[PDB]
Amino acid sequence: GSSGSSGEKPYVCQECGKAFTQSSCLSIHRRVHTGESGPSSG
């Protein structure tokens, strides 16, 4: 379900744009947030 208000899991990465169902997740994420990705893939 969804509510009609803001302030839902403030922790939201912007570099790649990935959310997390749990908390204190973005923390460890930033740790392994090195390198980039492009359309070119194997």
Ligand SMILES: [Zn+2]
């Ligand atoms: Zn990210």
